[PDB]
Amino acid sequence: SFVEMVDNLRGKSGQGYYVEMTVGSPPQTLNILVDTGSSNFAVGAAPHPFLHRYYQRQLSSTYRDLRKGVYVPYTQGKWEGELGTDLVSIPHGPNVTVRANIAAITESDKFFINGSNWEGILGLAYAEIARPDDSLEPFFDSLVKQTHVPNLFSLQLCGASVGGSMIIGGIDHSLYTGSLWYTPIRREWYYEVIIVRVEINGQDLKMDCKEYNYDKSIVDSGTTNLRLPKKVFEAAVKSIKAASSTEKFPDGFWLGEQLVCWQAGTTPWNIFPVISLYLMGEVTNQSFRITILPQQYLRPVEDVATSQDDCYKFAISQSSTGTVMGAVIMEGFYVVFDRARKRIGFAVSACHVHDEFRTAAVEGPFVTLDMEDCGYN
Numbered sequence: 001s002f003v004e005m006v007d008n009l010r011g012k013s014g015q016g017y018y019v020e021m022t023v024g025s026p027p028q029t030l031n032i033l034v035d036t037g038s039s040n041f042a043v044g045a046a047p048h049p050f051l052h053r054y055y056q057r058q059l060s061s062t063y064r065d066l067r068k069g070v071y072v073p074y075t076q077g078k079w080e081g082e083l084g085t086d087l088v089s090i091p092h093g094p095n096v097t098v099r100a101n102i103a104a105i106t107e108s109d110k111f112f113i114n115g116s117n118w119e120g121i122l123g124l125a126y127a128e129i130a131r132p133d134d135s136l137e138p139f140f141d142s143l144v145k146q147t148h149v150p151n152l153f154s155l156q157l158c159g160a161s162v163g164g165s166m167i168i169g170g171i172d173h174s175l176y177t178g179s180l181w182y183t184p185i186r187r188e189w190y191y192e193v194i195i196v197r198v199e200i201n202g203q204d205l206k207m208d209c210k211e212y213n214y215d216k217s218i219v220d221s222g223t224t225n226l227r228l229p230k231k232v233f234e235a236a237v238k239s240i241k242a243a244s245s246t247e248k249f250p251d252g253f254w255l256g257e258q259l260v261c262w263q264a265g266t267t268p269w270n271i272f273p274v275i276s277l278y279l280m281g282e283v284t285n286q287s288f289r290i291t292i293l294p295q296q297y298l299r300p301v302e303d304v305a306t307s308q309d310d311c312y313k314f315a316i317s318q319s320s321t322g323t324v325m326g327a328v329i330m331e332g333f334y335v336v337f338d339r340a341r342k343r344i345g346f347a348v349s350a351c352h353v354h355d356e357f358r359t360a361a362v363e364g365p366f367v368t369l370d371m372e373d374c375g376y377n
């Protein structure tokens, strides 16, 4: 009965994807950001200028105080609060209710977004990166332990204001085309994967493949951009600049600061290259690739002035904590987080990104020797 979960995600460009949830008795409705890059379930539980609503523990007869504080520092943004448990349900999800850990956010810094429509975050990664430590059971672990929901979920994140699906407990075959290609989960903490090759417009970047995974590579729906280790970022930007050199862009555009605009419908997509990321496969010396179009890594942004042009931000930025395959990478792919089999699947999404002469793709098999050497230790 996955049809009930199709289209259960909404969001705004650059502001994440959220799902509707309820917490407590009587149920309090809240919109919750879907984040495969963290492992804490947390909701606003005190007034805040950007919160339309929040969790009111005093009104829930099933709330239980854990008498323990918590804080989570992300790559950007952080919050602190009080731990507790309560009953939680997902209206457009499985027909179950579970008692889960909940962090009641009392203070936050650059976490909530002005006018975003979500009030909390659902960390879907593993206990090893939960705060305050790995003894705080994450939501999805509680769900699997307390119900018959199979130990996997899938994400169909769609571009253009945005929507998608989080299929809890399985794979919905109407949401993708072609074959699913799987890459091993290297270690159950983040959803960590191994990138074994990078090509831009079919040209190999020719770096030590360890550089691609320094110090890790993760699949993270809570991060907007494709984030790349310093050395990889420099090579990729150098290649993307060259391919698009027939037009001049401010240096702040390549840093993700300034936006670029063009007359509505005249965006020169053809001058921006496709990026191919090769992932470690399931059998010996085998990989597969996902191909990323510029319509993914040129994120559309509301024209702050006169909505007469098409304006974009460069959605590839530099990282000092490894590669992050963020939302703009996941968009247009159907991504299966197969926890039960320790693998992540990719297929072309039913809401795939369109170009006139090019198409996003998931292609295999490829032969790749010595893939284990690509993981950083």
Ligand SMILES: CC(C)c1cccc(CNC[C@@H](O)[C@@H]2C[C@H](C)CCCCCCCCC(=O)N(C)[C@@H](C)C(=O)N2)c1
Pocket: 014, 015, 016, 033, 035, 037, 038, 039, 072, 073, 074, 075, 076, 077, 111, 121, 129, 130, 220, 222, 223, 224, 225
């Ligand atoms: C929580 C622990 C496990 C942790 C520490 C450091 C990195 C990571 C990796 N995942 C980060 C991710 O969980 C984290 C989640 C967000 C704060 C959730 C709220 C904002 C969502 C919409 C705007 C997204 C802008 C963006 O890209 N951000 C805001 C990056 C930069 C980021 O940080 N994202 C996890």
